[PDB]
């Protein structure tokens, strides 16, 4: 987890990091 959430973890993050509490919003 701490390796898998690297590539696939630092994209998903750096998108929704603001994108994902107001997806809903």
Same mark, same amino acid.
């Given at each position: 987890? &701490?390796? !898998? &959430? @690297?590539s *696939?973890?630092?994209? +998903?993050? @750096? +998108? &929704?990091? +603001? @994108?994902? *509490? !107001?997806?809903?919003?």
């Open positions: 987890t &701490g390796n !898998v &959430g @690297l *696939p973890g630092l994209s +998903t993050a @750096l +998108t &929704g990091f +603001t @994108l994902v *509490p !107001v997806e809903d919003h």
